[PDB]
Write a protein that binds this ligand. Structure first.
Ligand code: HEM
Ligand SMILES: Cc1ccnc(N)c1
Length: 291
């Protein structure tokens, strides 16, 4: 199974910048969502979950086909809550019907990171919608109740190595866990709609207490009112992961650089880009455009 990127016919950088801008303007407008967090975090999570179904062994799943639009995937228990992100993107898709679903969902994540003052994330177009029978079965996204060995093995299916895993997990500074979605509750830190290295600082510097929450699941809770999943906490239990956590806690610029690379890789897994495809796009923020 090969998925070759195919640019939406007649479209170029400036067209995709317009889609970026529409997402970014709506992010600005819809500032009350989830008790004033806004939609940035859920859009990042959506971009990751539509990509994280990939299996490197047979090229099933991945962002290419836009299959989250089909009920089997939309209704995956692992995706509970992401319907909010999908609904946010609906008016964007109506305004720009020419964009593919996978391009829209992945671009939502890029837009969110940049508009939350994160690093620039280069982004490539050309994902092509595939039919309902190409939708991956549920169960390919990761469990949260597990240890470092589970995390390492899981992410190897996505061709991610230790540095990429630790960098990607820094997105857990964003947003919050919701008991009704996942059986976990609380934020990872204070600045949960601005992209920073706070996840790593909090892992290292907070006083964490293992507790069983109201859904009967174990999570690590700090005196400051933050939480970590068991899979998050595993990053300071495993010696190799811990070394990288320290690096990113000490150097936000390095975290930004590594996150940008890993997130682009995640969003592009499974896609073959022809050697004459456009170079990756770097979208201007609204601020950079005076909008
Ligand atoms: C071992 C891997 C991971 C596990 C087990 C995991 C698990 C979870 C869980 C249980 C939630 C809470 C969902 C809810 O209750 O609404 C969550 C939220 C989130 N996840 Fe992860 N995650 C993983 C990796 C990632 C990665 C790689 C990214 C992106 C780079 C990511 C981005 C996010 C974001 C931004 C949220 C907040 C969403 C919101 O506020 O609505 N996660 N994750
Ligand atoms: C919001 C969030 C998600 C996952 N892990 C955390 N520590 C925080």
């Amino acid at each position: 199974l090969v998925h070759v990127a195919s640019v939406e016919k007649g479209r170029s950088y400036e067209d995709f910048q317009k889609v970026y801008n529409a997402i970014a303007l709506k992010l600005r407008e819809d500032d009350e969502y989830d008790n004033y967090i806004g939609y940035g975090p859920v859009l990042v999570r959506l971009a990751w979950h539509i990509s994280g179904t990939w299996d490197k062994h047979d090229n099933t799943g991945g962002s290419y086909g836009g299959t989250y639009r089909f009920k089997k995937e939309f209704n995956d228990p692992s995706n509970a809550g992401l319907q909010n992100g999908f609904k946010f993107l609906e008016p964007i898709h109506k305004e720009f019907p020419w964009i593919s679903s996978g391009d829209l969902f992945s671009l939502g994540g890029v837009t969110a990171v940049q508009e939350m003052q994160g690093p620039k994330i280069p982004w490539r177009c050309g994902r092509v919608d595939t039919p309902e029978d190409t939708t991956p079965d549920n169960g390919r996204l990761p469990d949260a109740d597990k240890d470092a060995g589970y995390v390492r093995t899981f992410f190897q299916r996505l061709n991610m190595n230790d540095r990429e895993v630790v960098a990607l997990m820094g997105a857990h500074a964003l947003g919050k866990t919701h008991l009704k979605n996942s059986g976990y509750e609380g934020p990872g830190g204070a600045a949960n709609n601005v992209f920073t290295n706070e996840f790593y600082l909090n892992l290292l510097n907070e006083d964490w207490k293992l507790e069983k929450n109201d859904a009967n699941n174990e999570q690590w809770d700090s005196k400051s009112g933050y939480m970590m999943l068991p899979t998050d906490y595993s990053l300071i239990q495993d010696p190799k992961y811990l070394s990288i956590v320290k690096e990113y806690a000490n150097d936000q610029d390095k975290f930004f650089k590594d996150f940008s690379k890993a997130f682009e890789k995640l969003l592009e897994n499974g896609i073959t880009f022809p050697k004459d495809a456009p170079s990756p796009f770097i979208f201007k923020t609204l601020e950079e455009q005076g909008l």
